[PDB]
């Protein structure tokens, strides 16, 4: 039957994959990196204490003036806040209070968010009404919203629990590409640099780089033993961290196709949930269900420091594009910006 | 006098007017009741809804005694929910719909499956989750006008072979209502409300306030120290 | 987006009026507000700023115990109380939007105005000159100087320019020196420090040629420039 020739054939293509990835495995970083001084310690000092929500805080980005930051809830509000004051800019009520994202545009023209209603929401921040208004809901996901990042003021990026990534066109509310292939939940995206190859990470305990202008996947990376719940880009775009259910990060080369990087430590058995890298990419920043933050030598898998100024499960971290701060969510109420 | 410009002073009553407008909401949102609606497929979770006068989640806001509840019904939901239940920790009840005949007809294309197991199992799922141990569980049993018949013509035994009472609603009704109670491991700290109830049946609403208050009392009660 | 004004005609020395601003198309209780009284032979003079909230009420040194300022959010309208008119008082009032947050746009919409004919420290700014010859199709600069520097600690400059087409209200042109308002062409644009600004403009059209005020938004009471005027 041709039905077990094609997958004996599926197997013979995997084995030929991880050959020619072993065939490459005539070095580690961990040895070449042994060699340069140590990052040293990092003691970080809380600066700025944002509060306001009432409720468990789900999602964040910043912005690329490096001031501004959307702060999700499930309170069902959304907030725009002046991270050099404290000083609130806007707030946002939702149409459905179970939102899991959020999203700022890199202009700052737009804000993405959504969750629990297969719906994504982006209000307009810059009306002459002077109002924010819902300016489009994007919806034709079967399931839950988990991951939204912008691509430009008219290309949105979604993620979904129905085993899918899409690419909308704002100004219409339809796809005009979908990304399938996955076998789990898709839980968060990162966007390269380049704007042109996103990557995917999902409940499969697997990674996709993903060719967002042809609409197909370029590259599976696996490793992982349990579901993925956060990526990132390495700023070079040739490198992307990924962590997991199982206490793990993994630096994974889009390059060699293989797992690179592991950071791992006998005192972590928490579940990540975001992750992060300084603009120099020395630092992979990691929050962790233990009630804080880790930071990681990205070259030599040591950790180079703690955050421990929460009282709850981590949320998503961001790190402004200058470097100048990491922001850490929680499901206190509470966003810090360390610096 | 403080330093600031003018338009950053004008900025700060900005953010303590939203501040006000945001704890205002919070102050509403406090004194509402948030119900989990859950069961399996053509559980009746629609004829619940009708009786109580209430894609993705469907939130509907239903008031009695100038008391409100908002029900969150999530069976059209499809995904793994150990990575979408965590956003429900902070609900005073879940409500859980399961249709008696479901004993001797088959839900799951597995025609091996009884249903009512995998709704048993479902609630094994969710009872001792660590999201709800301390959320009670309200239980409806639905479709007894219906369950007679089945009674009459399909033992339980086709369900829970060591069921050895009789063909009757009574007794048939408090087997199955403690093998689903059983399935609750703790029992010194969650409560289980069950109530039996059919088309007619509008007091399911003076039922789930009732629940809902003991609920509260419950609560409150080993807040400050007298449970 | 309508800012209608009323409540104007010809009073008699001593007396007083109620002016009233309607607003429609935006939300006003989310914006402060400032009240602006023009003299056809003086230019623009800052009356008033009253806050979104229930918050500070800012008065001109000139009309303190005189003038109050009544506002109604729920009906999106402002009310003007002139007690003790003076034949000076004698002005054309426009009723201006505001909103003051990082990135917002102040000062960014002007009524139609009102006319009010009447019978019978600080920090002050100068404009280069009242008038100017021009020549379409080419650039202008237009300087505006301070008695203060108008950059604060901050980073930020509070320079507005403001252009008066004839028979319309002024309009918003540029945010603190470098910033274009929504809605004009990429042909202006300004810089300085310190006490000293330029306006610079690309080659001119017959829908710019006006009146070019400056405005400081330093500190309150504000005040504005004697305003240069193109001749085409």
């Known amino acids: 039957s041709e039905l077990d020739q094609l997958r004996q054939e599926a197997e013979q293509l995997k084995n030929q994959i991880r050959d020619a990835r072993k065939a490459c495995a005539d070095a580690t970083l961990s040895q070449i990196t042994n060699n340069i001084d140590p990052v040293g310690r990092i003691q970080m000092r809380t600066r700025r204490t944002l509060r306001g929500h009432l409720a468990k805080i789900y999602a964040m980005h910043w912005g690329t003036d490096s001031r501004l930051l959307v702060s999700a809830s499930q309170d069902g509000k959304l907030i725009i806040w002046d991270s050099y004051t404290t000083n609130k800019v806007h707030a946002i009520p939702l149409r459905s209070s179970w939102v899991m994202t959020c999203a700022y545009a890199p202009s700052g023209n737009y804000v993405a968010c959504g969750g629990l209603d297969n719906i994504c929401s982006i209000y307009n921040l810059k009306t002459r009404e002077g109002n924010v208004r819902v300016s489009r809901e994007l919806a034709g996901h079967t399931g839950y919203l988990s991951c939204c990042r912008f691509l430009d003021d008219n290309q949105i990026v979604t993620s979904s629990g129905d085993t899918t990534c899409a690419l909308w066109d704002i100004e219409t509310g339809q796809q005009t590409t979908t990304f399938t292939g996955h076998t789990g939940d898709v839980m968060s995206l990162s966007l390269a640099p380049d704007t042109r190859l996103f990557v995917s990470g999902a409940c499969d305990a697997s990674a996709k780089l993903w060719d967002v202008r042809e609409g197909m996947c370029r590259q599976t990376f696996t490793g992982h033993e349990s579901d993925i719940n956060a990526i990132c880009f390495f700023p070079n775009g040739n490198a992307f961290a990924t962590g997991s259910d199982d206490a793990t990060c993994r630096l994974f080369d889009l390059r060699a196709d293989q797992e690179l990087m592991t950071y791992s430590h006998d005192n972590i058995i928490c579940g990540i949930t975001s992750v992060s890298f300084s603009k120099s990419g020395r630092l992979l920043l990691a929050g962790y269900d233990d009630f804080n933050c880790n930071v990681w030598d990205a070259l030599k898998a040591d950790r180079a420091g703690v955050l421990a100024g929460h009282d709850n499960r981590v949320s998503c971290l961001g790190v402004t594009d200058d470097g100048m701060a990491v922001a850490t969510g929680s499901w206190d109420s509470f966003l810090k910006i360390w610096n | 006098g403080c330093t600031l410009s003018a338009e950053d002073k004008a900025a700060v009553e900005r953010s303590k007017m939203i501040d006000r407008n945001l704890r205002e909401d919070g102050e509403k949102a406090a004194r509402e009741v948030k119900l989990l609606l859950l069961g399996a497929g053509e559980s009746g979770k629609n004829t619940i809804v009708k009786q109580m006068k209430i894609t993705g989640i469907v939130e509907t806001h239903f008031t009695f005694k100038d008391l409100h509840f908002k029900m969150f019904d999530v069976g059209a939901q499809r995904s793994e929910r150990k990575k979408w239940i965590h956003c429900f920790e902070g609900v005073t009840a879940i409500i859980f719909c399961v249709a008696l005949s479901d004993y001797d007809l088959v839900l799951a294309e597995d025609e091996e499956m009884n249903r009512m197991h995998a709704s048993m199992k479902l609630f094994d799922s969710i009872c001792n989750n660590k999201w709800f141990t301390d959320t009670s569980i309200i239980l409806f049993l639905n479709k007894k006008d219906l369950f007679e018949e089945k009674i009459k013509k399909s033992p339980l035994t086709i369900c829970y072979p060591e069921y050895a009472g009789s063909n009757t609603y009574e007794e048939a009704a408090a087997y199955i209502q403690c093998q689903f109670e059983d399935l609750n491991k703790r029992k010194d700290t969650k409560e289980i409300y069950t109530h039996f109830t059919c088309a007619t049946d509008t007091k399911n609403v003076q039922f789930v306030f009732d629940a809902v208050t003991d609920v509260i009392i419950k609560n409150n009660l080993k807040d400050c120290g007298l449970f | 987006v309508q800012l209608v004004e009323s409540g104007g005609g010809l009073v008699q020395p001593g007396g007083s009026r109620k002016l009233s601003c309607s607003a429609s198309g935006f939300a006003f209780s989310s914006f402060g507000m400032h009240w602006v009284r023009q003299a056809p032979e003086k230019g623009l003079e800052w009356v008033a700023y009253?806050?979104?909230?229930?918050?500070?009420?800012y008065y001109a040194d000139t009309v303190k115990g005189r003038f109050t300022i009544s506002r109604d959010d729920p009906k999106n309208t402002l009310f003007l109380q002139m007690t003790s008119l003076r034949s000076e008082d004698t002005a054309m009032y426009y009723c201006?939007?505001?909103?003051?947050?990082?990135?917002?746009?102040?000062?960014?919409?002007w009524g139609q105005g009102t006319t009010l004919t009447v019978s019978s420290s600080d920090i002050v700014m100068t404009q280069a000159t009242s008038s100017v010859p021009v020549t379409p199709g080419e650039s202008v600069s237009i300087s505006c100087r301070s008695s203060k520097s108008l950059l604060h600690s901050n980073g930020n400059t509070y320079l507005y320019w403001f252009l008066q087409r004839p028979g319309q209200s002024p309009q918003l042109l540029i945010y603190r020196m470098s910033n274009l308002a929504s809605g004009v062409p990429d042909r202006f644009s300004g810089s300085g420090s310190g006490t000293a600004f330029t306006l610079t403009i690309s080659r001119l059209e017959a829908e710019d040629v006006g009146v070019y005020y400056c405005?400081?938004?330093?500190?309150?009471?504000?005040?504005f420039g004697a305003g240069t005027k193109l001749e085409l």
């Open positions: 009253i806050s979104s909230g229930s918050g500070t009420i």
């Open positions: 201006v939007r505001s909103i003051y947050y990082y990135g917002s746009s102040p000062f960014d919409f």
């Open positions: 405005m400081q938004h330093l500190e309150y009471p504000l005040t």
